[PDB]
Design a protein around this ligand. Structure first.
Ligand code: CDL
Ligand code: CDL
Ligand code: PC1
Lengths: 110, 32, 106, 365, 161, 231, 28
């Protein structure tokens, strides 16, 4: 019996920790209102860590917006009526170049 | 129609201003 | 409407008050002032809707080890529980019911 | 009986926001074919309180239009859904108009019901002839003291557990916590007992409403979001002179901001001359406020409601010609000139009045 | 309580006023220090409408000041005629003519429409994130039901005997 | 709330939500051995072992500045794995990426390790700051416990324990003390405690619609000239 | 007190004698 007494105890602590995460977030969210009414650098302070990830994109020269975002939802909103509608490929760096070139028996490498 | 006359006469004796909406509500209140 | 008045009185039409006070200060606040870049005691709002993961059991052990009863729970689970993960998910009562029929025989 | 007809139904908790049906009272007009009016009461307020207003022979509103005293979702008799989005609640009215075979209707509201009525004109302007808002404005009211009190009363009403509390416990709790006399009486009448004396409960969904008000964010009923857009039709606003909800100093500007055809004060926006009294919000209780609202309502329904935007009144229907924009008609051999805009029958979609009058027209020629 | 570590590593080339790495956030902080706080007016009326007569004087004073100083103003008016005609006839379609002639060129409108929708999504941020948590909280509450059953087994086993 | 209404929001010329192989004119085409004279290609089969070595380098070079903090090392490992597990769990089909997803991620991680080897990566500077702020608070608690004093966290825990006893001693009709009721007891104490502290204003608007800043001082004017320092 | 409530809605001053005649009218 002591096997499930301690198993269910640790199982409950895992989901009690998850419950406190969602509870505490809704608690801190009470002071945050109208993101449109905060300055740029203050909104990043509420969402601590976004400035760090923004520096990672800059220092690695990943300055293609939304390249490392799995769902670049901002990229889809910007290209709703674009010609050749496309979003950047995942983790595309502006410096990489995978171009190849071959010589065949025919012209133009065909 | 007959229940309308019963309520109207009661409201008549108390010289209280009555409307058809009040009577319809009171009659509906009796059946309800 | 598209006819709000003269150019000089344009910043007048923006204010909307929640009280009955007169005269009304016209200026409509754009942003919240942030004079000092103070580190907020508030936790980050990024920790919003992340599913269950390894950080949940790692932090559970850290907080459980703050108690005497919690130290016994952690030690028994990490040693004497045949599971291939610490992310325990209860999807059936097999391990629970079989532990009761093996116990209530006395 | 005949004039008062309220369809009886049971509220159904719906998971889908589109399977929401609205219930309410229907008031039959004096005459055979009249346009219909859909009116929304204040949040957590009885539809029956407006029956003596709409059935008063002195005001004679039913001589103009049929009135639907309709409850919004999570209120009264209608279905319950946790969302209070004004767009989703506006689509509820359109399904109600369809099920009731209503092509287009006048919209009215009191307080928050005024916001709901105006929102339907914002999302479905082609189905709405006009909006008559009583003591409301399309503005964020989350910080008005009057709304905070209502928000506080709903929060305190969540403390009562109908299973454990007795009737005397509830009466004491309401008198002590709800100091406003009218809000107290309204909340008592919302308490009803289910079948087989199971228990008591509020007619409105107290859980869904409290979370909406307590969260105090964009979807709150006190807030008016930019997402709602602009109402393009006829709109009339009336509110007390000293109203805790609409302040004459600045709370009129939202009306110009949202309603495109509002001319201004004295034409589409009036204030009822009255004293300072926290109960003046309930205009139907006081004859002085009710007489002015009814006269302004009769003037709206009779001459301004359902009239083209560029026409002054209904008197200009058929004698005022509106300029036309060039290259706006499909006919290529069309001489562009002024025209009088077409006004259609109030329920032309579900009747054959245009087919019947076509045949009667051929008999003449 | 066990004694924790005194401190972590302290980077010798990173500070708050001179951060080592770059982002728009630090630039935004120094930008608002420069332009200062939002110059909120405490008055009942805006400054322009209250001083229209006075600003009109100083508006015309500097016009006359430039007019009295510029003795060859006619040479400047004539020298400006050719570029005024040229640039306006050349850029008319791209600025205004496109609104009623051959092509609309709605590229800049698409950028306004997307940003106007994002403005609404940010305004409803608290609502959308709260609905996403209602589903995760439902999953968490479902897992916590197994511990409620186990805590009653001791009472069940005692009452069954 | 608000939902995107455009049903074609995730449509691309290559398919729905396709951010792995966007459609372009110069599409990849096969090569035939018998007909190919020479070729210039940079692709190879070295990304797998480079992915393994990069993880060992990033882990070991970051642990140089952890000062033997065991909890920080284990926390950093969980964070480092979340960076390497991106291609294995992402919605994007990382196996269908245009010109080899494996090579792309390995080259992307090498740029991170170059910054890590110099101790200049923003994830590193963020870790030192977060850990220093955490240890400073743990040292404050340790000094209060050695002095026999009660920590602020123990005062709330003790205050919350007596609140549950008081609520469960009056709630005798029902005996199911749910986690929902336990939560709103703590949150009622947390709000009261947070409002008690002298914190900078976080919300834009106070009880009124007005902003809670120092700039939100309007008429009436009732403040005199500023006074100087006292001797 | 349903009879009292409908009368209250119409803002008609009602005496106690009127309420009893109405209740007797329904019950009788
Ligand atoms: C020795 C004797 C000589 C020395 C004497 C010393 C005394 C000198 C007198 C100077 C007085 C200083 C005190 C007042 C300074 C500001 C004046 C003012 O109008 O501010 C109120 C006005 C609004 O104040 P508010 O009522 O509180 O409303 C707040 C809301 O934000 C409002 O925003 P909103 O959009 O909601 O509402 C409408 C808004 C609409 O207004 C705006 O928002 C923007 C208006 C356009 C701004 C200017 C665009 C210029 C673009 C740059 C190109 C020219 C640069 C000039 C220099 C280039 C190199 C020469 O403004 C209004 O309320 C109505 C317009 C009022 C007129 C303002 C525009 C006039 C032109 C001022 C520019 C002067 C320089 C260019 C003139 C020609 C060259 C000489 O603020 C501004 O317009 C700011 C503009 C920049 C200010 C500095 C400009 C230089 C000084 C301006 C003097 C103006 C008269 C002389 C020139 C006129 C020539 C025609
Ligand atoms: C590859 C492109 C074409 C190449 C040809 C050269 C260009 C054409 C010359 C005339 C220009 C008028 C055409 C409209 C251009 C509008 C494009 C535009 O401005 O962007 C709007 C566009 C978004 O704005 P939008 O409002 O959605 O655009 C739609 C329009 O508003 C309206 O919406 P929509 O859906 O109706 O537009 C559809 C579009 C579709 O266009 C096409 O699909 C092209 C047709 C297929 C190609 C046919 C050529 C075949 C080529 C291969 C064969 C060549 C063999 C040669 C020998 C071999 C050599 C080895 O336009 C057409 O339908 C063309 C039909 C022409 C109508 C003819 C009507 C009869 C006229 C009778 C009177 C004649 C009077 C003549 C007097 C002179 C005219 C003023 O921006 C972008 O797409 C950005 C991406 C760039 C697209 C690709 C580059 C195209 C050029 C863009 C402008 C420059 C971009 C770089 C600067 C960017 C900022 C820094
Ligand atoms: C403003 C000041 C700074 C200016 C900087 C320049 C700003 C430029 C803004 C971006 C515009 C770039 C246009 C690229 C083409 C976009 C359209 C497209 O993808 O075609 C899809 C098209 C259109 O398909 P579609 O489906 O997307 O659109 C269909 C169109 N309708 C809707 C009307 C039916 O399909 C093709 O595949 C045709 C490919 C033709 C290629 C034409 C572009 C060739 C030149 C690009 C390379 C130039 C590099 C120059 C570098 C110089 C360095 C020295």
């Amino acid at each position: 019996l002591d096997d499930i007494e301690n198993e269910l105890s640790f199982h409950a602590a895992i989901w009690l920790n998850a419950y406190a995460d969602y509870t505490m977030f809704l608690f801190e969210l009470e002071e945050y209102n109208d993101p449109n009414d905060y300055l740029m650098h203050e909104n990043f302070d509420f969402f601590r860590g976004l400035e760090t990830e923004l520096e990672e994109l800059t220092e690695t020269h990943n300055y293609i917006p939304g390249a490392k975002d799995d769902v670049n939802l901002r990229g889809y909103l910007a290209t709703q009526f674009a010609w050749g509608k496309k979003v950047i490929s995942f983790y595309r760096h502006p410096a990489d170049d995978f171009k190849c070139a071959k010589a065949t028996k025919n012209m133009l490498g065909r | 129609a007959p229940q309308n006359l019963e309520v109207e006469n009661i409201l008549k004796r108390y010289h209280i201003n009555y409307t058809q909406a009040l009577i319809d509500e009171l009659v509906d209140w009796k059946t309800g | 409407t598209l006819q709000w008045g003269s150019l000089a009185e344009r910043p007048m039409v923006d204010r909307v008050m929640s009280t009955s006070t007169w005269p009304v200060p016209y200026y409509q606040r754009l942003f919240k002032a942030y004079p000092i870049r103070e580190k907020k005691d508030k936790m980050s709002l990024l920790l919003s809707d992340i599913d269950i993961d390894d950080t949940n059991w790692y932090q559970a052990k850290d907080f459980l080890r703050g108690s005497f009863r919690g130290r016994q729970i952690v030690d028994y689970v990490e040693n004497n529980i045949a599971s291939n993960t610490y992310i325990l998910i209860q999807q059936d009562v097999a391990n629970m019911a079989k532990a009761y029929v093996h116990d209530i025989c006395g | 009986s005949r004039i008062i007809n309220h369809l009886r139904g049971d509220p159904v908790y719906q998971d889908n926001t589109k399977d929401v049906s609205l219930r309410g009272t229907f008031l039959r007009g004096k005459y055979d074919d009249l346009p219909t009016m859909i009116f929304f009461t204040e949040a957590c307020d009885l539809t029956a309180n407006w029956i003596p207003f709409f059935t008063n022979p002195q005001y004679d509103i039913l001589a103009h239009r049929n009135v639907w005293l309709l409850n919004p979702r999570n209120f009264g008799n209608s279905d319950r859904h946790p969302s209070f989005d004004l767009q989703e609640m506006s689509d509820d009215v359109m399904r109600f108009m369809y099920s009731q075979k209503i092509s287009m209707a006048t919209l009215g509201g009191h307080g928050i019901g005024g916001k709901i009525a105006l929102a339907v004109g914002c999302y479905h302007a082609e189905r709405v002839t006009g909006v008559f808002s009583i003591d409301s404005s399309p503005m964020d009211q989350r910080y008005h003291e009057a709304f905070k009190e209502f928000k506080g009363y709903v929060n305190a009403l969540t403390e009562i557990n109908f299973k454990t509390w007795s009737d005397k416990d509830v009466k004491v709790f309401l008198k002590e916590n709800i100091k406003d006399p009218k809000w107290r009486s309204i909340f008592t009448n919302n308490i009803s007992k289910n079948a087989k004396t199971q228990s008591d409960s509020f007619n409105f969904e107290i859980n869904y409403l409290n979370h909406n008000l307590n969260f105090n964010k964009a979807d709150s009923l006190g807030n008016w979001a930019v997402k709602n857009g602009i109402y393009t039709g006829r709109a009339h606003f009336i509110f007390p002179e000293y109203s805790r909800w609409v302040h004459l100093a600045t709370n009129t500007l939202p009306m110009h901001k949202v309603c495109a055809r509002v001319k201004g004060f004295g034409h589409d926006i009036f204030y009822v001359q009255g004293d300072e009294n926290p109960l003046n919000h309930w205009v139907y209780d006081f004859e002085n406020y009710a007489n002015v609202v009814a006269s302004k309502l009769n003037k709206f329904l009779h001459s301004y409601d359902g009239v083209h935007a560029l026409l002054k009144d209904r008197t200009e229907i058929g004698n005022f010609m509106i300029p036309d924009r060039i290259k706006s008609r499909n006919d290529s051999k069309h001489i562009y000139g002024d025209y009088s805009p077409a006004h259609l029958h109030h329920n032309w979609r579900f009747n054959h009045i245009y087919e019947k009058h076509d045949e009667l027209d051929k008999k003449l020629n | 309580m066990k004694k924790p570590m005194a401190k972590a590593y302290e980077h010798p080339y990173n500070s708050e006023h001179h951060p080592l790495n770059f982002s728009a956030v630090k630039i935004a902080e120094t930008f608002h220090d420069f332009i200062g706080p939002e110059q909120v007016s405490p008055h009942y009326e805006s400054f322009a409408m209250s001083r229209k007569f006075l600003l009109t004087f100083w508006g015309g004073f500097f016009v006359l000041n430039f007019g009295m100083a510029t003795v060859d103003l006619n040479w400047i008016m004539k020298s400006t005629y050719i570029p005024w005609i040229f640039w306006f006839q050349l850029m008319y379609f791209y600025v205004e003519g496109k609104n009623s002639m051959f092509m609309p060129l709605l590229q800049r409108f698409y950028r306004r429409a997307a940003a106007n929708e994002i403005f609404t999504m940010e305004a409803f941020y608290h609502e959308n994130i709260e609905n996403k948590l209602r589903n995760l909280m439902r999953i968490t509450k479902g897992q916590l039901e197994y511990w409620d059953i186990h805590t009653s087994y001791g009472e069940i086993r005692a009452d069954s005997i | 709330g608000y939902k995107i209404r455009n049903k074609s929001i995730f449509w691309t010329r290559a398919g729905w939500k396709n951010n792995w192989h966007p459609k372009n004119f110069n599409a990849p085409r096969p090569s035939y051995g018998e007909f190919t004279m020479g070729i210039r290609c940079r692709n190879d089969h070295h990304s797998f072992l480079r992915y393994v070595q990069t993880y060992r380098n990033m882990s070991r070079h970051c642990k140089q500045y952890f000062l033997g903090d065991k909890q920080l090392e284990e926390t950093f490992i969980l964070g480092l794995r979340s960076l390497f597990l991106v291609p294995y769990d992402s919605q994007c089909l990382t196996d269908q990426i245009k010109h080899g997803g494996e090579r792309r991620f390995v080259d992307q991680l090498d740029r991170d390790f170059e910054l890590i080897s110099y101790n200049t990566h923003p994830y590193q500077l963020f870790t030192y700051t977060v850990r220093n702020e955490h240890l400073a608070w743990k040292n404050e608690q340790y000094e209060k416990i050695q002095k026999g004093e009660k920590t602020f966290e123990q005062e709330l825990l003790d205050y919350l324990d007596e609140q549950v006893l008081a609520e469960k001693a009056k709630l005798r009709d029902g005996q199911n003390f749910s986690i929902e009721r336990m939560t709103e007891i703590a949150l009622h104490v947390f709000r009261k405690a947070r409002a008690g502290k002298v914190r900078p204003a976080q919300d834009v608007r106070g009880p009124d619609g007005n902003v809670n800043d120092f700039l939100e001082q309007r008429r009436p004017f009732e403040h005199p000239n500023p006074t100087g320092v006292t001797h």
